[PDB]
Design a protein around this nucleic acid. Structure first.
Ligand SMILES: [Mg+2]
Ligand SMILES: [Mg+2]
Ligand SMILES: [Mg+2]
Ligand SMILES: [Mg+2]
Ligand SMILES: [Mg+2]
Ligand SMILES: [Mg+2]
Ligand SMILES: [Mg+2]
Ligand SMILES: [Mg+2]
Ligand SMILES: [Mg+2]
Ligand SMILES: [Mg+2]
Ligand SMILES: [Mg+2]
Ligand SMILES: [Mg+2]
Ligand SMILES: [Mg+2]
Ligand SMILES: [Mg+2]
Ligand SMILES: [Mg+2]
Ligand SMILES: [Mg+2]
Ligand SMILES: [Mg+2]
Ligand SMILES: [Mg+2]
Ligand SMILES: [Mg+2]
Ligand SMILES: [Mg+2]
Ligand SMILES: [Mg+2]
Ligand SMILES: [Mg+2]
Ligand SMILES: [Mg+2]
Ligand SMILES: [Mg+2]
Ligand SMILES: [Mg+2]
Ligand SMILES: [Mg+2]
Ligand SMILES: [Mg+2]
Ligand SMILES: [Mg+2]
Ligand SMILES: [Mg+2]
Ligand SMILES: [Mg+2]
Ligand SMILES: [Mg+2]
Ligand SMILES: [Mg+2]
Ligand SMILES: [Mg+2]
Ligand SMILES: [Mg+2]
Ligand SMILES: [Mg+2]
Ligand SMILES: [Mg+2]
Ligand SMILES: [Mg+2]
Ligand SMILES: [Mg+2]
Ligand SMILES: [Mg+2]
Ligand SMILES: [Mg+2]
Ligand SMILES: [Mg+2]
Ligand SMILES: [Mg+2]
Ligand SMILES: [Mg+2]
Ligand SMILES: [Mg+2]
Ligand SMILES: [Mg+2]
Ligand SMILES: [Mg+2]
Ligand SMILES: [Mg+2]
Ligand SMILES: [Mg+2]
Ligand SMILES: [Mg+2]
Ligand SMILES: [Mg+2]
Ligand SMILES: [Mg+2]
Ligand SMILES: [Mg+2]
Ligand SMILES: [Mg+2]
Ligand SMILES: [Mg+2]
Ligand SMILES: [Mg+2]
Ligand SMILES: [Mg+2]
Ligand SMILES: [Mg+2]
Ligand SMILES: [Mg+2]
Ligand SMILES: [Mg+2]
Ligand SMILES: [Mg+2]
Ligand SMILES: [Mg+2]
Ligand SMILES: [Mg+2]
Ligand SMILES: [Mg+2]
Ligand SMILES: [Mg+2]
Ligand SMILES: [Mg+2]
Ligand SMILES: [Mg+2]
Ligand SMILES: [Mg+2]
Ligand SMILES: [Mg+2]
Ligand SMILES: [Mg+2]
Ligand SMILES: [Mg+2]
Ligand SMILES: [Mg+2]
Ligand SMILES: [Mg+2]
Ligand SMILES: [Mg+2]
Ligand SMILES: [Mg+2]
Ligand SMILES: [Mg+2]
Ligand SMILES: [Mg+2]
Ligand SMILES: [Mg+2]
Ligand SMILES: [Mg+2]
Ligand SMILES: [Mg+2]
Ligand SMILES: [Mg+2]
Ligand SMILES: [Mg+2]
Ligand SMILES: [Mg+2]
Ligand SMILES: [Mg+2]
Ligand SMILES: [Mg+2]
Ligand SMILES: [Mg+2]
Ligand SMILES: [Mg+2]
Ligand SMILES: [Mg+2]
Ligand SMILES: [Mg+2]
Ligand SMILES: [Mg+2]
Ligand SMILES: [Mg+2]
Ligand SMILES: [Mg+2]
Ligand SMILES: [Mg+2]
Ligand SMILES: [Mg+2]
Ligand SMILES: [Mg+2]
Ligand SMILES: [Mg+2]
Ligand SMILES: [Mg+2]
Ligand SMILES: [Mg+2]
Ligand SMILES: [Mg+2]
Ligand SMILES: [Mg+2]
Ligand SMILES: [Mg+2]
Ligand SMILES: [Mg+2]
Ligand SMILES: [Mg+2]
Ligand SMILES: [Mg+2]
Ligand SMILES: [Mg+2]
Ligand SMILES: [Mg+2]
Ligand SMILES: [Mg+2]
Ligand SMILES: [Mg+2]
Ligand SMILES: [Mg+2]
Ligand SMILES: [Mg+2]
Ligand SMILES: [Mg+2]
Ligand SMILES: [Mg+2]
Ligand SMILES: [Mg+2]
Ligand SMILES: [Mg+2]
Ligand SMILES: [Mg+2]
Ligand SMILES: [Mg+2]
Ligand SMILES: [Mg+2]
Ligand SMILES: [Mg+2]
Ligand SMILES: [Mg+2]
Ligand SMILES: [Mg+2]
Ligand SMILES: [Mg+2]
Ligand SMILES: [Mg+2]
Ligand SMILES: [Mg+2]
Ligand SMILES: [Mg+2]
Ligand SMILES: [Mg+2]
Ligand SMILES: [Mg+2]
Ligand SMILES: [Mg+2]
Ligand SMILES: [Mg+2]
Ligand SMILES: [Mg+2]
Ligand SMILES: [Mg+2]
Ligand SMILES: [Mg+2]
Ligand SMILES: [Mg+2]
Ligand SMILES: [Mg+2]
Ligand SMILES: [Mg+2]
Ligand SMILES: [Mg+2]
Ligand SMILES: [Mg+2]
Ligand SMILES: [Mg+2]
Ligand SMILES: [Mg+2]
Ligand SMILES: [Mg+2]
Ligand SMILES: [Mg+2]
Ligand SMILES: [Mg+2]
Ligand SMILES: [Mg+2]
Ligand SMILES: [Mg+2]
Ligand SMILES: [Mg+2]
Ligand SMILES: [Mg+2]
Ligand SMILES: [Mg+2]
Ligand SMILES: [Mg+2]
Ligand SMILES: [Mg+2]
Ligand SMILES: [Mg+2]
Ligand SMILES: [Mg+2]
Ligand SMILES: [Mg+2]
Ligand SMILES: [Mg+2]
Ligand SMILES: [Mg+2]
Ligand SMILES: [Mg+2]
Ligand SMILES: [Mg+2]
Ligand SMILES: [Mg+2]
Ligand SMILES: [Mg+2]
Ligand SMILES: [Mg+2]
Ligand SMILES: [Mg+2]
Ligand SMILES: [Mg+2]
Ligand SMILES: [Mg+2]
Ligand SMILES: [Mg+2]
Ligand SMILES: [Mg+2]
Ligand SMILES: [Mg+2]
Ligand SMILES: [Mg+2]
Ligand SMILES: [Mg+2]
Ligand SMILES: [Mg+2]
Ligand SMILES: [Mg+2]
Ligand SMILES: [Mg+2]
Ligand SMILES: [Mg+2]
Ligand SMILES: [Mg+2]
Ligand SMILES: [Mg+2]
Ligand SMILES: [Mg+2]
Ligand SMILES: [Mg+2]
Ligand SMILES: [Mg+2]
Ligand SMILES: [Mg+2]
Ligand SMILES: [Mg+2]
Ligand SMILES: [Mg+2]
Ligand SMILES: [Mg+2]
Ligand SMILES: [Mg+2]
Ligand SMILES: [Mg+2]
Ligand SMILES: [Mg+2]
Ligand SMILES: [Mg+2]
Ligand SMILES: [Mg+2]
Ligand SMILES: [Mg+2]
Ligand SMILES: [Mg+2]
Ligand SMILES: [Mg+2]
Ligand SMILES: [Mg+2]
Ligand SMILES: [Mg+2]
Ligand SMILES: [Mg+2]
Ligand SMILES: [Mg+2]
Ligand SMILES: [Mg+2]
Ligand SMILES: [Mg+2]
Ligand SMILES: [Mg+2]
Ligand SMILES: [Mg+2]
Ligand SMILES: [Mg+2]
Ligand SMILES: [Mg+2]
Ligand SMILES: [Mg+2]
Ligand SMILES: [Mg+2]
Ligand SMILES: [Mg+2]
Ligand SMILES: [Mg+2]
Ligand SMILES: [Mg+2]
Ligand SMILES: [Mg+2]
Ligand SMILES: [Mg+2]
Ligand SMILES: [Mg+2]
Ligand SMILES: [Mg+2]
Ligand SMILES: [Mg+2]
Ligand SMILES: [Mg+2]
Ligand SMILES: [Mg+2]
Ligand SMILES: [Mg+2]
Ligand SMILES: [Mg+2]
Ligand SMILES: [Mg+2]
Ligand SMILES: [Mg+2]
Ligand SMILES: [Mg+2]
Ligand SMILES: [Mg+2]
Ligand SMILES: [Mg+2]
Ligand SMILES: [Mg+2]
Ligand SMILES: [Mg+2]
Ligand SMILES: [Mg+2]
Ligand SMILES: [Mg+2]
Ligand SMILES: [Mg+2]
Ligand SMILES: [Mg+2]
Ligand SMILES: [Mg+2]
Ligand SMILES: [Mg+2]
Ligand SMILES: [Mg+2]
Ligand SMILES: [Mg+2]
Ligand SMILES: [Mg+2]
Ligand SMILES: [Mg+2]
Ligand SMILES: [Mg+2]
Ligand SMILES: [Mg+2]
Ligand SMILES: [Mg+2]
Ligand SMILES: [Mg+2]
Ligand SMILES: [Mg+2]
Ligand SMILES: [Mg+2]
Ligand SMILES: [Mg+2]
Ligand SMILES: [Mg+2]
Ligand SMILES: [Mg+2]
Ligand SMILES: [Mg+2]
Ligand SMILES: [Mg+2]
Ligand SMILES: [Mg+2]
Ligand SMILES: [Mg+2]
Ligand SMILES: [Mg+2]
Ligand SMILES: [Mg+2]
Ligand SMILES: [Mg+2]
Ligand SMILES: [Mg+2]
Ligand SMILES: [Mg+2]
Ligand SMILES: [Mg+2]
Ligand SMILES: [Mg+2]
Ligand SMILES: [Mg+2]
Lengths: 45, 272
RNA sequence: CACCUCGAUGUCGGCUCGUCGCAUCCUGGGGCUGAAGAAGGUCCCAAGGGUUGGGCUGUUCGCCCAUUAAAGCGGCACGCG
RNA sequence: UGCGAAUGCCGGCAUGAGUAACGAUAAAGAGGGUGAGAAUCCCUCUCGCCGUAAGCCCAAGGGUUCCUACGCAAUGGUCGUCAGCGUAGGGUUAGGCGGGACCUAAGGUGAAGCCGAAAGGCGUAGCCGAAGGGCAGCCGGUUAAUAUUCCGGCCCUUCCCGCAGGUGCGAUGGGGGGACGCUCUAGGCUAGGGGGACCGGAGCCAUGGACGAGCCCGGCCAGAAGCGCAGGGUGGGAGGUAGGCAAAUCCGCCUCCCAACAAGCUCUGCGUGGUGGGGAAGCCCGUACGGGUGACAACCCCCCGAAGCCAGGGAGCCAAGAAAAGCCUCUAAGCACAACCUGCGGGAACCCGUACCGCAAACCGACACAGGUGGGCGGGUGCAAGAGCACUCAGGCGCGCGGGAGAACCCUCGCCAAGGAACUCUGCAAGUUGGCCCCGUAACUUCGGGAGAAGGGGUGCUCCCUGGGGUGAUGAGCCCCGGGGAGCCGCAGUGAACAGGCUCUGGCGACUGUUUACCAAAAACACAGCUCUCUGCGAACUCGUAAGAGGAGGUAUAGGGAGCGACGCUUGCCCGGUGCCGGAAGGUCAAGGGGAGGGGUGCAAGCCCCGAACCGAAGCCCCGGUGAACGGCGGCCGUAACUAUAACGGUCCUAAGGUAGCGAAAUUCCUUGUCGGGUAAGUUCCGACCUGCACGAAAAGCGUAACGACCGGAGCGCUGUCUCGGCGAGGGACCCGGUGAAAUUGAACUGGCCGUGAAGAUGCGGCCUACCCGUGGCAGGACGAAAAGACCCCGUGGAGCUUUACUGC
RNA sequence: GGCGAGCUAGCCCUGGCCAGGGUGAAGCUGGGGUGAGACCCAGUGGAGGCCCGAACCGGUGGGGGAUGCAAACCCCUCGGA
RNA sequence: CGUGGUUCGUGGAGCCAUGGGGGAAUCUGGGCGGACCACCGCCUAAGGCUAAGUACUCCGGGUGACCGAUAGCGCACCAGU
RNA sequence: CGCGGGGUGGAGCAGCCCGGUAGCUCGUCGGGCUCAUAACCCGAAGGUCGUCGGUUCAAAUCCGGCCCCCGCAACCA
RNA sequence: CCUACGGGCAGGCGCCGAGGGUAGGGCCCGUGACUGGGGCGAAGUCGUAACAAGGUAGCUGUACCGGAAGGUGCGGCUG
């Protein structure tokens, strides 16, 4: 039946994308955290 | 005055529709003087703050003239009477001799063709607006202002009206549709006549759908809920209130008065 | 009563399949009778086999209808998921 | 710092086991080819399956999967020469398609401005924001692979410059327009389709007949201007003007005068059109796909005909149906050797996408997963219609293990003598019924219904006669509705497929609807409708610290809260307690005021601290009201000229002692109450009685036509439900070849009885029985597996919920 | 303290979809009727949380499946349309 | 008056800070020495700056009765993969 | 079996707490008024306090046992 | 089969048809747990509604209420 993942390029960017992450102070920390952990990708591709 | 139907379906058996004979040639609803786009929206910033709303036919707003003193002296001709979905009353299209067009909330009797006008002048006749002080004591009026220059606010619902009971000082004593005895400033504009379309109160929606067209989603009793979410939810099964009847938010809902006591408005009132 | 089982021994009734006990419902053999005969009563021997179909109720049970040689009681984790 | 246990942790390898499985029962067979190797790759022929698809085209998502060469270790549920797999090379071409150098929608963001300890929250304009508005490309050819993109043909847009001709030009501003619902629908077209005795075309005569008005195949597509046909849009002129936040000559309003029609003007659709292009079967070529010929192909009439086009078309209706730009008009600054408008000519025209999958082996589901995924096309014949059903075209597929065998048992199917619900918790299940036309149809009813009630008859083919309509000329032909008559055949004519079993009677809910995604669809929720109550508008109420916002651009015929729940007849008594409402008195009451009087220290002025009276809110007390407010609504005893019973009476208590109606009930404990009905028999069902353990009037009372995949009772019909089984079919099970899991598992050389044992022994005692090892089967035992029992208790363990528990906010 | 409404629930903006058949409300026109009416009848008309039934949305009963094709599926049946 | 800070939890509760109300003085002015008064003393509020001694280790180096690939950082190896 | 309440003239209720006093209405009996009955008025009688024990100087009263009566309870199972 | 054969009879088919069967209606009668009132019955119970202002003038149509007669409201009649 209909499962939970329903890919949608715009939604993904609008929700987890770099710019969205930079607006909220909470988001900017997610970046700070990932950057400090040395992630190769700060944001979903 | 009110249409019946033959029971050729259940619900049609009890269903009742408004009479639209008063509606002078009409359908398109006069762009320019309105409509504006009306923002159907059931919440505030995110959150529902009035339960059980949403859906129901799309609707164009008619920007109506709740301040007639806007054009004192200038007479106008009643061009049309039309259906306004945003209110119980019906609206009249006014052709001012200025060439200005405006919708007025149509009073009972108002016939297409009549001249109408507003001002201290103005012949006390249905359709005309005046400051309250210049209106004969005892005359029935509508679309009243509550404070001078702040626009009409009282007696606008289909069938309603206020009565002028007397004057005292800069104020006059009105009897409002509610039955309340109110002092209002004599400078406040009113308009002679009662509102009209007074058979409105006698329509029978007939079916659930009809309520839905009007944007009214099903309303559920506290009784039908659980304690988590209403003072009346619980039991096993059916259950009296087991407390003084309450609203979802805890307050009592049978008689418990709610008007703020120390309200400055207090010294201008005197009834039910 | 609280002894094994609560890091699990699935619980009524029905169905299916039975097997065993005899304190025997029928059939077989007996004694006694307040046993003329026929039919019973009561006790003794006997477990080979047999021990119906339906209405009512989830029912076990029981009541009832129509039969029958008889429409037997119990045990098997109130046998058997 | 020493391991055997922790349902320990990581890893490795075992057991079950050559066992279950190999993923839809649409299906396969042979020949030839390739190759080290072939049921599995290529080719041919035969067979089967999809065809409102299982074919084709878009949008998402995916991101090389695309084409080609080489290749098979792994991935492929087997095989593999094959592949969506490994290596390499190639492949995506736009002024007109989509999106962007356009518009705005919800919403988002946000100069101004407002609020907030910080973070930050709001917010007019503006800006962002699309599958909506606007906007210029059609047909065909070409590649192994792209094409409205390259090409060929025909056609068009904007921008810059210039030439000419025209006009007061000129905007972010004014105005118009864009511009809008649902249902039904006219005319005329188009797409699409059928037929043709006409036109073109290779061939064909088998097997008894046919050289025939035979069989088979095809008979179009695009196209500017002009021209037709059909529609859409639109009145013209003059005068006045104070309104459209400046100004208008524009729009609005008034007057007058001319058209009232689409006349004209304008726009669109379709036809036609210079020209351009396509062009079957069959046969021949080799494919792995295509290519030649047919060909100088023909290229035409008739019919059916859209849900699509003319489109802003028409009618009706109520629930009353975006915005903004493009566009046109108006003027403002400004400029008017400007500028704009028209025509012509020359130049200029950018960024991104474009492969391939796309109902699926390439997307979402760990999988080449029987699930899920939005838009368009979706041919033919028949069946009343249709996107239904059967078969079939184009196209695409036989589902990535096979070969045998013919047991039990299982699944999915077909049939059954006599009986026909005797089955069972229950007709569960299955069967019966079944489409269309006609006849015909009850109680009751809210007059609509109930109705497809029920129950019946007809149903094919042949010839003859005949009515009406459409399209054509009235006509023929073609198409469409029929009507009458006489006959033919079978067991059977909706001959296959798709297609109600019916009735009677209770309970609950009025009704259509809604719900526990994944054990409950219901008598639960909702619902129109009735009542109570709050709310005068900066409304109440809700969200928020606030600003702010919803309410509502609403205003008591409105909005919030609560209960009840269509409709009918109704809805009694109690205000003592609790709630709410009212009450300027009185009692009590905090801070504060007030200070009579007292205390500490100073030599003293003083400083400092207590402190009575009395004056001080809400709240509470107190006095009243209030029942569609929380709620409540009696006990014992006696009595009538048979008996029995008690209309009547006595007494005790209450705030008042249950009215109507109903009642062994979705409520009745005793209980299968008693009586009557149904049945041969009735713990249930229906009617009734009233002894109501423990009905009763808006947590409504009693009824009610219609409605229900609700729950109960009965009958007819029909049956494999059953007496009571039997046979048959296919997919498994079984054997062979290929691949090959799992939970479980202290180790095992693992028998019966009677005992014993922590009380239910393969493992101890006695006796009995018993050669070693498997295979197909059954399920009594291994207190069999699974899950650290959900029940129960325990823990001064947790959590949701309640309130006149405590204490806070 | 952050992350989530790409599932699911509600609402907001903008689009799309619902084969075919049946029943036949009002209104309208006509006829009758009356002092005038109500009203009756015929045709026309085409209303409805109306009927039958695909798509589509469902999930009623049964059977199968239960280390599944599937961590909700398949078949028959059924509800709305 | 309401609170915080200090060992101080309203305590005999001073001191320092301050949301509210009232509200001065400039050396004989003011604060403090734990309620308050006297006495005796200490100190100058309502402006600001100020090295060093102190904390930490992304980074570099030196050491080890520190590990030695199930250890040691999650990573000795193209791992925050 | 549990828990609470109760038994008092003929009927129905007090008095039991706080020991010494049995009280109320109705009924019963006698007498009035009426022709008569009832209503009404005047008089009166009638109970050891369920029963058996115990406490006390004294028990309806305080305590215990039995007997009945009313009401509640009997849940997970 | 018979002829006196372009005929008759036998025999075959068809129509209608007594009635039987299936189904649904209509009227009437009998009967039924139980239930409604009614009539009648020498000396039963409760009250007093009416007849004399019947001791609240009566009666009345309706409406509500009450063991019961009845009472009350609204309007009417006088008998
Ligand atoms: Mg779906
Ligand atoms: Mg994922
Ligand atoms: Mg996942
Ligand atoms: Mg998108
Ligand atoms: Mg920062
Ligand atoms: Mg990197
Ligand atoms: Mg937000
Ligand atoms: Mg209403
Ligand atoms: Mg509700
Ligand atoms: Mg609930
Ligand atoms: Mg919640
Ligand atoms: Mg609550
Ligand atoms: Mg409650
Ligand atoms: Mg209850
Ligand atoms: Mg024990
Ligand atoms: Mg013990
Ligand atoms: Mg165990
Ligand atoms: Mg014996
Ligand atoms: Mg014996
Ligand atoms: Mg014998
Ligand atoms: Mg004998
Ligand atoms: Mg004898
Ligand atoms: Mg039964
Ligand atoms: Mg028995
Ligand atoms: Mg029994
Ligand atoms: Mg036995
Ligand atoms: Mg037992
Ligand atoms: Mg037994
Ligand atoms: Mg048992
Ligand atoms: Mg079982
Ligand atoms: Mg069982
Ligand atoms: Mg070890
Ligand atoms: Mg050990
Ligand atoms: Mg095995
Ligand atoms: Mg096997
Ligand atoms: Mg196998
Ligand atoms: Mg197969
Ligand atoms: Mg293949
Ligand atoms: Mg091929
Ligand atoms: Mg893509
Ligand atoms: Mg690749
Ligand atoms: Mg390929
Ligand atoms: Mg190859
Ligand atoms: Mg390989
Ligand atoms: Mg392989
Ligand atoms: Mg596989
Ligand atoms: Mg090879
Ligand atoms: Mg490849
Ligand atoms: Mg395209
Ligand atoms: Mg573009
Ligand atoms: Mg540019
Ligand atoms: Mg843009
Ligand atoms: Mg924009
Ligand atoms: Mg800030
Ligand atoms: Mg913001
Ligand atoms: Mg905004
Ligand atoms: Mg568009
Ligand atoms: Mg458009
Ligand atoms: Mg374009
Ligand atoms: Mg092309
Ligand atoms: Mg291609
Ligand atoms: Mg080109
Ligand atoms: Mg010029
Ligand atoms: Mg000028
Ligand atoms: Mg504009
Ligand atoms: Mg048409
Ligand atoms: Mg065409
Ligand atoms: Mg055509
Ligand atoms: Mg020819
Ligand atoms: Mg030739
Ligand atoms: Mg021949
Ligand atoms: Mg020829
Ligand atoms: Mg042809
Ligand atoms: Mg043709
Ligand atoms: Mg064509
Ligand atoms: Mg053409
Ligand atoms: Mg004009
Ligand atoms: Mg003008
Ligand atoms: Mg102006
Ligand atoms: Mg003009
Ligand atoms: Mg025209
Ligand atoms: Mg054309
Ligand atoms: Mg043309
Ligand atoms: Mg040509
Ligand atoms: Mg040519
Ligand atoms: Mg060709
Ligand atoms: Mg190839
Ligand atoms: Mg229109
Ligand atoms: Mg703009
Ligand atoms: Mg101009
Ligand atoms: Mg040009
Ligand atoms: Mg492409
Ligand atoms: Mg492509
Ligand atoms: Mg494709
Ligand atoms: Mg699918
Ligand atoms: Mg599909
Ligand atoms: Mg599709
Ligand atoms: Mg496909
Ligand atoms: Mg594929
Ligand atoms: Mg596969
Ligand atoms: Mg699949
Ligand atoms: Mg997949
Ligand atoms: Mg499904
Ligand atoms: Mg079609
Ligand atoms: Mg078809
Ligand atoms: Mg036919
Ligand atoms: Mg059909
Ligand atoms: Mg089909
Ligand atoms: Mg084919
Ligand atoms: Mg195959
Ligand atoms: Mg397969
Ligand atoms: Mg068959
Ligand atoms: Mg049979
Ligand atoms: Mg038979
Ligand atoms: Mg039968
Ligand atoms: Mg039986
Ligand atoms: Mg039975
Ligand atoms: Mg059942
Ligand atoms: Mg039944
Ligand atoms: Mg069935
Ligand atoms: Mg059959
Ligand atoms: Mg059927
Ligand atoms: Mg008929
Ligand atoms: Mg009918
Ligand atoms: Mg019925
Ligand atoms: Mg029928
Ligand atoms: Mg029939
Ligand atoms: Mg035939
Ligand atoms: Mg004709
Ligand atoms: Mg035509
Ligand atoms: Mg003709
Ligand atoms: Mg005929
Ligand atoms: Mg026939
Ligand atoms: Mg049917
Ligand atoms: Mg009933
Ligand atoms: Mg319902
Ligand atoms: Mg739904
Ligand atoms: Mg659902
Ligand atoms: Mg569920
Ligand atoms: Mg659940
Ligand atoms: Mg507001
Ligand atoms: Mg608003
Ligand atoms: Mg209200
Ligand atoms: Mg309810
Ligand atoms: Mg109800
Ligand atoms: Mg009541
Ligand atoms: Mg009373
Ligand atoms: Mg009360
Ligand atoms: Mg009171
Ligand atoms: Mg009260
Ligand atoms: Mg009060
Ligand atoms: Mg006072
Ligand atoms: Mg004080
Ligand atoms: Mg003081
Ligand atoms: Mg002193
Ligand atoms: Mg006082
Ligand atoms: Mg009180
Ligand atoms: Mg008083
Ligand atoms: Mg007696
Ligand atoms: Mg006698
Ligand atoms: Mg006597
Ligand atoms: Mg009495
Ligand atoms: Mg009661
Ligand atoms: Mg009663
Ligand atoms: Mg009754
Ligand atoms: Mg009964
Ligand atoms: Mg009850
Ligand atoms: Mg009987
Ligand atoms: Mg009976
Ligand atoms: Mg039952
Ligand atoms: Mg009882
Ligand atoms: Mg009730
Ligand atoms: Mg009750
Ligand atoms: Mg009630
Ligand atoms: Mg009822
Ligand atoms: Mg329903
Ligand atoms: Mg149902
Ligand atoms: Mg029966
Ligand atoms: Mg069978
Ligand atoms: Mg077979
Ligand atoms: Mg094998
Ligand atoms: Mg052995
Ligand atoms: Mg043993
Ligand atoms: Mg031993
Ligand atoms: Mg042994
Ligand atoms: Mg063996
Ligand atoms: Mg074996
Ligand atoms: Mg076993
Ligand atoms: Mg087995
Ligand atoms: Mg176990
Ligand atoms: Mg445990
Ligand atoms: Mg605790
Ligand atoms: Mg969502
Ligand atoms: Mg479609
Ligand atoms: Mg539609
Ligand atoms: Mg229709
Ligand atoms: Mg007429
Ligand atoms: Mg008609
Ligand atoms: Mg009509
Ligand atoms: Mg019609
Ligand atoms: Mg419907
Ligand atoms: Mg229906
Ligand atoms: Mg149906
Ligand atoms: Mg349907
Ligand atoms: Mg299902
Ligand atoms: Mg369900
Ligand atoms: Mg099942
Ligand atoms: Mg199932
Ligand atoms: Mg169906
Ligand atoms: Mg269906
Ligand atoms: Mg402190
Ligand atoms: Mg303390
Ligand atoms: Mg502290
Ligand atoms: Mg001090
Ligand atoms: Mg201060
Ligand atoms: Mg000083
Ligand atoms: Mg100091
Ligand atoms: Mg100091
Ligand atoms: Mg200083
Ligand atoms: Mg300083
Ligand atoms: Mg510093
Ligand atoms: Mg340190
Ligand atoms: Mg370092
Ligand atoms: Mg070492
Ligand atoms: Mg290692
Ligand atoms: Mg390591
Ligand atoms: Mg090593
Ligand atoms: Mg490190
Ligand atoms: Mg590691
Ligand atoms: Mg690395
Ligand atoms: Mg007594
Ligand atoms: Mg005493
Ligand atoms: Mg007396
Ligand atoms: Mg006396
Ligand atoms: Mg005693
Ligand atoms: Mg004594
Ligand atoms: Mg409990
Ligand atoms: Mg009859
Ligand atoms: Mg009688
Ligand atoms: Mg009688
Ligand atoms: Mg009297
Ligand atoms: Mg009287
Ligand atoms: Mg009287
Ligand atoms: Mg009289
Ligand atoms: Mg009366
Ligand atoms: Mg009565
Ligand atoms: Mg009484
Ligand atoms: Mg009177």
């Amino acid at each position: 039946m209909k499962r939970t993942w329903q890919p949608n390029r715009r939604k993904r960017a609008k929700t987890h994308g770099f710019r969205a992450r930079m607006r909220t102070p909470g988001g900017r920390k997610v970046l700070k955290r990932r950057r400090q952990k040395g992630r190769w990708r700060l944001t979903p591709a | 005055a009110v249409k019946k139907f033959k029971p050729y379906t259940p619900s049609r058996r009890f269903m009742t529709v408004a009479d639209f004979s008063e509606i002078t040639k009409t359908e398109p609803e006069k762009s320019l003087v309105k409509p504006l786009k009306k923002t159907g929206g059931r919440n505030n910033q995110g959150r529902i703050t009035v339960r059980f709303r949403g859906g129901g036919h799309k609707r164009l707003y008619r920007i109506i003239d709740f301040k007639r003193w806007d054009k004192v002296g200038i007479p106008a001709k009643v061009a049309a009477i039309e259906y306004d979905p945003n209110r119980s009353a019906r609206i009249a299209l006014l052709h001012y001799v200025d060439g200005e067009k405006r919708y007025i909330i149509a009073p009972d009797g108002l016939q297409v063709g009549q001249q109408v006008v507003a001002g201290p002048d103005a012949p006390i006749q249905v359709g005309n607006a005046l400051p309250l002080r210049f209106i004969p004591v005892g005359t029935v009026v509508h679309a009243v202002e509550l404070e001078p220059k702040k626009g009409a606010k009282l007696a606008r619902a289909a069938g309603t009206s206020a009565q002028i009971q007397g004057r005292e000082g800069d104020y006059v004593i009105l009897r409002l549709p509610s039955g309340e005895l109110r002092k209002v400033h004599g400078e406040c504009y009113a308009t002679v006549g009662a509102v009209g379309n007074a058979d409105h109160k006698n329509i029978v929606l007939g079916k659930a759908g009809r309520s839905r067209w009007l944007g009214r989603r099903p309303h559920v009793r506290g009784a039908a809920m659980n304690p988590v979410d209403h003072p009346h939810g619980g039991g096993e099964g059916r259950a009296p209130r087991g407390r003084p009847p309450a609203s979802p938010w805890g307050w009592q809902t049978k008689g418990l008065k709610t008007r703020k006591r120390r309200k400055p408005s207090s010294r201008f009132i005197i009834a039910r």
